[PDB]
Design a protein around this motif. Sequence first.
Motif, PDB file in Angstrom:
ATOM      1  N   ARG A 116     -24.799   8.893  -3.796  1.00 25.69           N
ATOM      2  CA  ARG A 116     -24.645   9.414  -4.945  1.00 25.69           C
ATOM      3  C   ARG A 116     -23.173   9.320  -5.386  1.00 25.69           C
ATOM      4  O   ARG A 116     -22.903   9.034  -6.585  1.00 25.69           O
ATOM      5  CB  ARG A 116     -25.419  10.225  -5.618  1.00 25.69           C
ATOM      6  CG  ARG A 116     -27.033   9.369  -5.916  1.00 25.69           C
ATOM      7  CD  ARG A 116     -28.186   9.876  -5.788  1.00 25.69           C
ATOM      8  NE  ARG A 116     -28.870  11.200  -5.537  1.00 25.69           N
ATOM      9  CZ  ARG A 116     -30.104  11.388  -5.033  1.00 25.69           C
ATOM     10  NH1 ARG A 116     -30.955  11.035  -5.729  1.00 25.69           N
ATOM     11  NH2 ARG A 116     -30.037  12.432  -4.436  1.00 25.69           N
ATOM     12  N   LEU A 117     -22.656  10.671  -4.870  1.00 25.82           N
ATOM     13  CA  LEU A 117     -21.926  11.962  -5.511  1.00 25.82           C
ATOM     14  C   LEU A 117     -20.326  10.770  -4.782  1.00 25.82           C
ATOM     15  O   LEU A 117     -19.359  10.812  -5.832  1.00 25.82           O
ATOM     16  CB  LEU A 117     -21.396  12.787  -4.144  1.00 25.82           C
ATOM     17  CG  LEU A 117     -22.566  13.663  -4.808  1.00 25.82           C
ATOM     18  CD1 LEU A 117     -21.574  15.644  -4.609  1.00 25.82           C
ATOM     19  CD2 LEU A 117     -22.297  14.026  -6.202  1.00 25.82           C
ATOM     20  N   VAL A 118     -20.277   9.302  -3.583  1.00 25.42           N
ATOM     21  CA  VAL A 118     -19.645   8.751  -4.004  1.00 25.42           C
ATOM     22  C   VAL A 118     -19.573   7.845  -4.692  1.00 25.42           C
ATOM     23  O   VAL A 118     -18.228   7.371  -5.409  1.00 25.42           O
ATOM     24  CB  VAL A 118     -20.034   7.476  -2.561  1.00 25.42           C
ATOM     25  CG1 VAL A 118     -19.073   6.672  -2.285  1.00 25.42           C
ATOM     26  CG2 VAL A 118     -19.565   8.930  -0.953  1.00 25.42           C
ATOM     27  N   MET A 137      -6.551   4.731 -16.458  1.00 25.80           N
ATOM     28  CA  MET A 137      -5.812   5.509 -17.666  1.00 25.80           C
ATOM     29  C   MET A 137      -4.220   5.448 -17.578  1.00 25.80           C
ATOM     30  O   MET A 137      -3.742   6.585 -18.246  1.00 25.80           O
ATOM     31  CB  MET A 137      -6.046   7.276 -17.178  1.00 25.80           C
ATOM     32  CG  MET A 137      -8.264   7.536 -18.884  1.00 25.80           C
ATOM     33  SD  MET A 137      -9.018   8.625 -17.876  1.00 25.80           S
ATOM     34  CE  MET A 137      -7.257  10.373 -18.407  1.00 25.80           C
ATOM     35  N   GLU A 138      -4.247   5.555 -16.147  1.00 22.85           N
ATOM     36  CA  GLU A 138      -3.158   5.659 -15.827  1.00 22.85           C
ATOM     37  C   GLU A 138      -1.850   4.297 -16.555  1.00 22.85           C
ATOM     38  O   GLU A 138      -0.792   4.326 -17.162  1.00 22.85           O
ATOM     39  CB  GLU A 138      -2.075   5.769 -14.540  1.00 22.85           C
ATOM     40  CG  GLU A 138      -2.917   6.368 -13.257  1.00 22.85           C
ATOM     41  CD  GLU A 138      -3.099   5.710 -12.094  1.00 22.85           C
ATOM     42  OE1 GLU A 138      -2.170   6.679 -11.016  1.00 22.85           O
ATOM     43  OE2 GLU A 138      -4.264   5.492 -11.488  1.00 22.85           O
ATOM     44  N   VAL A 145     -14.728   7.867 -10.820  1.00 17.45           N
ATOM     45  CA  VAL A 145     -13.395   8.743 -11.903  1.00 17.45           C
ATOM     46  C   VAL A 145     -12.380   8.343 -10.892  1.00 17.45           C
ATOM     47  O   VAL A 145     -11.264   7.896 -12.370  1.00 17.45           O
ATOM     48  CB  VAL A 145     -13.714  10.746 -10.715  1.00 17.45           C
ATOM     49  CG1 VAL A 145     -12.397  11.168 -11.437  1.00 17.45           C
ATOM     50  CG2 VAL A 145     -15.305  10.475 -11.414  1.00 17.45           C
ATOM     51  N   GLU A 146     -12.823   7.411 -10.185  1.00 15.02           N
ATOM     52  CA  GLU A 146     -11.432   6.357 -10.049  1.00 15.02           C
ATOM     53  C   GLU A 146     -10.858   5.354 -10.371  1.00 15.02           C
ATOM     54  O   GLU A 146      -9.656   5.746 -11.000  1.00 15.02           O
ATOM     55  CB  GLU A 146     -11.288   6.263  -8.505  1.00 15.02           C
ATOM     56  CG  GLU A 146     -10.142   5.747  -7.645  1.00 15.02           C
ATOM     57  CD  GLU A 146      -9.057   6.697  -7.216  1.00 15.02           C
ATOM     58  OE1 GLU A 146      -7.879   6.218  -7.225  1.00 15.02           O
ATOM     59  OE2 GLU A 146      -9.117   8.079  -6.735  1.00 15.02           O
ATOM     60  N   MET A 193     -28.084  12.733  -1.346  1.00 13.58           N
ATOM     61  CA  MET A 193     -27.156  12.935  -2.477  1.00 13.58           C
ATOM     62  C   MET A 193     -25.826  12.958  -2.055  1.00 13.58           C
ATOM     63  O   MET A 193     -24.817  12.777  -3.020  1.00 13.58           O
ATOM     64  CB  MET A 193     -27.333  14.766  -1.747  1.00 13.58           C
ATOM     65  CG  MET A 193     -28.358  16.017  -2.718  1.00 13.58           C
ATOM     66  SD  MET A 193     -28.271  17.276  -2.082  1.00 13.58           S
ATOM     67  CE  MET A 193     -29.129  18.144  -0.914  1.00 13.58           C
ATOM     68  N   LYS A 194     -24.922  12.960  -1.231  1.00 10.47           N
ATOM     69  CA  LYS A 194     -23.810  12.324  -0.548  1.00 10.47           C
ATOM     70  C   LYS A 194     -23.611  11.187  -0.964  1.00 10.47           C
ATOM     71  O   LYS A 194     -22.296  10.727  -1.773  1.00 10.47           O
ATOM     72  CB  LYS A 194     -23.906  11.787   1.175  1.00 10.47           C
ATOM     73  CG  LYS A 194     -22.666  12.121   1.199  1.00 10.47           C
ATOM     74  CD  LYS A 194     -22.975  12.024   3.578  1.00 10.47           C
ATOM     75  CE  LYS A 194     -23.660  10.527   3.704  1.00 10.47           C
ATOM     76  NZ  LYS A 194     -23.676  10.846   4.977  1.00 10.47           N
ATOM     77  N   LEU A 224     -12.108   5.069 -14.443  1.00 13.86           N
ATOM     78  CA  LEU A 224     -11.297   5.274 -14.919  1.00 13.86           C
ATOM     79  C   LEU A 224     -10.104   5.716 -15.223  1.00 13.86           C
ATOM     80  O   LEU A 224      -9.352   5.584 -16.102  1.00 13.86           O
ATOM     81  CB  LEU A 224     -12.158   6.452 -15.347  1.00 13.86           C
ATOM     82  CG  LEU A 224     -12.436   7.593 -16.771  1.00 13.86           C
ATOM     83  CD1 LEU A 224     -12.142   6.549 -18.489  1.00 13.86           C
ATOM     84  CD2 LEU A 224     -12.998   8.681 -16.911  1.00 13.86           C
ATOM     85  N   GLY A 225      -9.700   6.389 -13.481  1.00 11.64           N
ATOM     86  CA  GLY A 225      -8.538   7.108 -13.562  1.00 11.64           C
ATOM     87  C   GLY A 225      -7.032   6.082 -13.705  1.00 11.64           C
ATOM     88  O   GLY A 225      -5.893   6.261 -14.035  1.00 11.64           O
ATOM     89  N   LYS A 226      -7.392   4.618 -13.685  1.00  8.19           N
ATOM     90  CA  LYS A 226      -6.413   3.496 -12.823  1.00  8.19           C
ATOM     91  C   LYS A 226      -6.416   3.216 -14.687  1.00  8.19           C
ATOM     92  O   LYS A 226      -5.080   2.740 -14.348  1.00  8.19           O
ATOM     93  CB  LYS A 226      -7.115   2.642 -11.956  1.00  8.19           C
ATOM     94  CG  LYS A 226      -6.806   2.974 -10.776  1.00  8.19           C
ATOM     95  CD  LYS A 226      -6.132   2.396 -10.000  1.00  8.19           C
ATOM     96  CE  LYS A 226      -6.075   2.937  -8.387  1.00  8.19           C
ATOM     97  NZ  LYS A 226      -5.133   2.048  -7.300  1.00  8.19           N
ATOM     98  N   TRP A 248     -19.650   8.257  -8.192  1.00  6.86           N
ATOM     99  CA  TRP A 248     -19.451   9.415  -8.949  1.00  6.86           C
ATOM    100  C   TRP A 248     -17.404   9.440  -8.415  1.00  6.86           C
ATOM    101  O   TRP A 248     -17.131   8.926  -9.809  1.00  6.86           O
ATOM    102  CB  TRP A 248     -19.941  10.454  -8.585  1.00  6.86           C
ATOM    103  CG  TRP A 248     -19.798  11.775  -9.989  1.00  6.86           C
ATOM    104  CD1 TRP A 248     -18.896  12.461 -10.723  1.00  6.86           C
ATOM    105  CD2 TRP A 248     -20.844  12.905 -10.217  1.00  6.86           C
ATOM    106  NE1 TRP A 248     -18.957  13.272 -11.123  1.00  6.86           N
ATOM    107  CE2 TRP A 248     -20.093  13.260 -11.799  1.00  6.86           C
ATOM    108  CE3 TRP A 248     -22.403  12.682 -10.226  1.00  6.86           C
ATOM    109  CZ2 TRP A 248     -20.529  14.355 -12.362  1.00  6.86           C
ATOM    110  CZ3 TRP A 248     -22.320  13.617 -10.959  1.00  6.86           C
ATOM    111  CH2 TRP A 248     -22.054  14.940 -11.947  1.00  6.86           C
ATOM    112  N   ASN A 249     -16.922   9.504  -7.569  1.00  5.92           N
ATOM    113  CA  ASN A 249     -15.679   9.655  -7.212  1.00  5.92           C
ATOM    114  C   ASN A 249     -16.231   8.230  -7.546  1.00  5.92           C
ATOM    115  O   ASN A 249     -14.610   8.512  -7.809  1.00  5.92           O
ATOM    116  CB  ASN A 249     -15.741   9.380  -5.843  1.00  5.92           C
ATOM    117  CG  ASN A 249     -14.311  10.304  -5.072  1.00  5.92           C
ATOM    118  OD1 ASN A 249     -13.840   9.068  -4.358  1.00  5.92           O
ATOM    119  ND2 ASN A 249     -13.776  11.175  -5.498  1.00  5.92           N
TER     120      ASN A 249
END
Lengths: 388, 146, 203, 197
Positions: free
Chosen positions: A364-366, A379-380, A372-373, A361-362, A375-377, A368-369
């Motif tokens: 799979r969320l790395v 978006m900047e 997001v990061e 679970m841990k 996509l964020g780059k 995911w993180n």
Amino acid sequence: EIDTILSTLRMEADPSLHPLFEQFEKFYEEKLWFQLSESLTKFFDDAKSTPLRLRLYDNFVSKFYDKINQLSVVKYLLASLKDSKDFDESLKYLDDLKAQFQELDSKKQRNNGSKDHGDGILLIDSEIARTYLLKNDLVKARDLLDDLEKTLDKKDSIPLRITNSFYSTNSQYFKFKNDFNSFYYTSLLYLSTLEPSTSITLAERQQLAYDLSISALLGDKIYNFGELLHHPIMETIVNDSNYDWLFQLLNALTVGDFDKFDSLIKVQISKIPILAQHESFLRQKICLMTLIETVFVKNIRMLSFEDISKATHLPKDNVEHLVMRAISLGLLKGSIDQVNELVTISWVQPRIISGDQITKMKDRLVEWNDQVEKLGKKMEARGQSIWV
Amino acid sequence: SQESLVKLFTTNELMRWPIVQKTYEPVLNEDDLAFGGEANKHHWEDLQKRVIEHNLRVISEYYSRITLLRLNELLDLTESQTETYISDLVNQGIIYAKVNRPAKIVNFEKPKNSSQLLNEWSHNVDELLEHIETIGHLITKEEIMH
Amino acid sequence: FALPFEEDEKNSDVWFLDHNYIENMNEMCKKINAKEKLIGWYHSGPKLRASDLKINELFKKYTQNNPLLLIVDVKQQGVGLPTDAYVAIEQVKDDGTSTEKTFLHLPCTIEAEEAEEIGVEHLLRDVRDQAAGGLSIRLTNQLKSLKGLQSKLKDVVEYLDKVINKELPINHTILGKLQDVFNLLPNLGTPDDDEIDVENHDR
Amino acid sequence: MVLEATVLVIDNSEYSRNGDFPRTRFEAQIDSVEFIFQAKRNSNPENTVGLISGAGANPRVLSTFTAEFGKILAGLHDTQIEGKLHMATALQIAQLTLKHRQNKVQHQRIVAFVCSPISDSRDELIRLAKTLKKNNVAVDIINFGEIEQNTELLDEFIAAVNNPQEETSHLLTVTPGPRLLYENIASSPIILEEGSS
């Protein structure tokens, strides 16, 4: 006074028990009743195998009930009426001790100006049902437990000991019917809510541990086999012959082996004939533990039929059947596609979480993180020049 | 005997008709004023219709699509009698299916609508964001208490 | 309102509280407004402690309900949560665990009274970077929103690691919620995702 | 002592359950709490007295400084009677009470009854002894609750706090069996006890 009775019990008892009766004479006399309350509790635990318990309690309960702890009068009673083989006697002394406390709070509360003695009434009440259980009047005991439950809810604070006895009784009721599921779920609460005080033996937990194990295996809704092992009760008790083969039956189901399960079961079908008549339910439970487990650890939430067929070692026909039964239970929920040979899930029912699954679970969320990061780059980069 | 019967029909199960018939033939069928009378022989015959309608309802919900060839086998009916039973139960408005006459599939689904699917998706995203927002508070709670 | 209060750093089980103050403040506030009654206590925080459960017990003798402990960060370290709310409840905790007295998170939001509103309007004379305005205001938001979530997601990762590394107590409530996180993941290649890409062209 | 404020500690315990004064030690303590309050008022009428619980892990303030006997009296009945004394916590919570006061012209006094021996480490009271006398706070220990069968751990703590300045600790030795507790207070210093220069 009561010194004469104490002396007579002492001649009658075993040499090993002679020190305890002397302790009771000296403590009453000095008028120190904290010592006297502890020393009695130790007696009724260890010398209720000797039948000199029956005449000893009588002296203390009926002459002290405000001069000893509110818990302790009920403690001496519960031990004496446990090894009792008369149900008429078990019932009897309960009606008596119930009278004392109802009477007592008419005066005492007024003079004293504090202290409630109604806590102890409810243990007595669990014990009246308890007497009914052994006598085989199960129906009567049920009503008295539901009337107990009501009182519990309108209490602001409920100490753990009070609800512990309630659940013990409730547990006994369920195993008479042989409702594995209903017993299992009631027993966990008993185990959790167990008192930090010691006056329970290793032996008692042991007996219970056999009972937990069996319910947990011959159930059909139970996919927690280490919820047993997060209590000492089955965890630390694995070192006898009987609780070796039994621990192994639990563990084989946990990691979902069919090979290991076959070896144990074969042997224990002969040995335990409770296990043989319930062999069918158990044998398929293995496949269902593999179904819920495999889709959970994988990232994809749709599973092919061929995947289940190799793992569970069954025809493709038998696989569909298993899937339909999982939807029915609520083990998994979703859509069953025969043509495309899918089962595409929409619900995972909440499971036991072991260290390995947390790791999954841990992880799979790395990812995911990171997703997001990135996509964020992006978006900047677009819109850097204007935001407002 | 009555207890297993009531239980079977209430809860959602898949079951086959000559095996259920074999269970309750020496049991219930010989109890008079139910099944053991003469025009209650045709209330026994009726018990079958109710079993094959139970299987149709279950299979409708859980199976989104299934071959017709298969569905026949599980119900213990001939091809012809399967189609007519599906049809009657679609007139009476309970279930919905599209059965092929070439006998490739039956699609037990009422084909889902565009808006509802999108609606369903938008809600799941709000549940993920709510779920994380609550989780973060309880992390703070546990670390400090430790 | 404030009350007289002392906080000792040498032992956290020592603090002062004046009881007589709470009784005298009640008399007064019923005269101004009888719709006002004690409902619990604020605590400056940001750190919640276990000794605070015992302060909690005290406040359970002026209000029938469980007291609300309203953590208000005055140091302004959080860019969000300027209110977190918890209520003490007493429950048998799972996994062989005892009955624990504990502070469970219960949803809170700022919503303002109507009479309050008037002043909120007066004192806000700033342009408001987040107010939900025009195209401009919500493009600034959308970016802000991604970094919000991402940081929230980062706390979950760290937490999980410390459970099996540094042996934090398993709190199975958190872990249960995470099972549903994996169960509400969008899965591609289903007819739903495909309809969503058609809908982007529709719009 | 003239011009003194006093925090009474009523000992809530399972040694207070135990009877060694009539009716039990709890019902004995209602009478002795009334005794001290009035005696002290007569000797100097500016004296004013609070009450805090010797119960659980946390002592709770039942009353603050007041010279209505009725406010102190009410708390004696209301408090739960079965608990354990915790001396360390008491000294500190009592000390806060003596902080927040009408005028600090008065001496800071703790009078604390003992029914149950200490339930805390010894050395913590030794360290706390020097902090108490640093702010000129004295602690009177009424001992009938550690001479039942107990060795007296109390004496060394009274040694550490005692040192003439303006305030000096006393150890009231009270016989352990029935004679009525109030009377035992009376025969021990309680209108002639004083802090020494």
